Amino acid sequence: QLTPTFYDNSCPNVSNIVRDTIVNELRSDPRIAASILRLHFHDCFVNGCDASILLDNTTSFRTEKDAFGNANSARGFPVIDRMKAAVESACPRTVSCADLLTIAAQQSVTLAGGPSWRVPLGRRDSLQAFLDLANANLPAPFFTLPQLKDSFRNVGLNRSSDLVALSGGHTFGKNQCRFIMDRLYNFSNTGLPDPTLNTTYLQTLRGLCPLNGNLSALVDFDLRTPTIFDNKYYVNLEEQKGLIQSDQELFSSPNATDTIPLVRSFANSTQTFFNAFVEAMDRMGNITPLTGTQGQIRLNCRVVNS
Ligand code: HEM
Ligand SMILES: [Ca+2]
Ligand SMILES: [Ca+2]
């Protein structure tokens, strides 16, 4: 059983060390908080939160960093290396990379203005990486609501609240033009833009992502508060201003009878959203963890101990 007090005796200053690292990095990279939260998400959706995503290539297994959902997208790995080294200095061979990344995600959310809470701890590090599993398990922006639900259920998150609350992670961070080109110019081979995208916002997005333009150009997930962790993400959905297909479907999908009330509830109250987000985050952080003597306490998050 994971517990928030896991390192209260062995490394009481772990959370503080993680926080300081992120505070320092935010000065040169204001996007790092969002990037770190996403790393935790992609870690947990593949064999659980076991730091498998942090592993680099080996001749026996491929890195998850080359998965369609991570390649030329996932970032912040050097920052994780930095806090790991700092934590190793303060508490040698004590904090797992899996736990470190979980704390980093929570601290990132709080630093961005989100809720503050103590995450359950006690996770251990994987002995291998899972590229095929990452390609199969990570959801894509073009997923329909049924597919999004399937993706979450596949890893153990059955609740629509899990999906709606965790999608709130898009209240900050960036998204490449490549992922919305269809919504802007030819959605579902209709030759027309996605009808669920607000027409005024459509114009703005087309200006940022012209046809045949730079597909790697970055756009803000939340047009209201691009870098602040708040409930504005849901207010956007209510106005048909969700950026990617998977965002807007939470409010507009024919299958959204169960998610619409959640979107509204989170848009109506910051407290309701924050509570639901913490609840969902801890549930996601509880996905098939290695505990006790299973796995290791990786010293270098990029490689298995030898
Ligand atoms: C529900 C399905 C989801 C899909 C299909 C999805 C898809 C995406 C895509 C397409 C990007 C843009 C990547 C890029 O352009 O490089 C992204 C970024 C991001 N996602 Fe999601 N996401 C989902 C759920 C989540 C969840 C559950 C969280 C965390 C609680 C999360 C947090 C983020 C953050 C913070 C970013 C910004 C990262 C950065 O700017 O570096 N996402 N997501
Ligand atoms: Ca993992
Ligand atoms: Ca925001």
From Swiss-Prot:
What's any one GO cellular component for it? Answer: vacuole
Report which reactions are catalysed by this protein.
2 a phenolic donor + H2O2 = 2 a phenolic radical donor + 2 H2O
- The protein's recorded glycosylation sites are N13, N57, N158, N186, N198, N214, N255, N268
Entries under Pfam families matching the protein: peroxidase (PF00141)
Keyword Oxidoreductase on entry: yes
> Which positions does UniProt annotate for heme b binding?
H170
- Ligand binding (Ca(2+) 1): D43, V46, G48, D50, S52, E64
Where it mainly occurs, coarsely classed, is secreted
What PANTHER family does this protein map onto?
A: PEROXIDASE 33-RELATED, PEROXIDASE 72-RELATED
Protein's recorded name: Peroxidase C1A
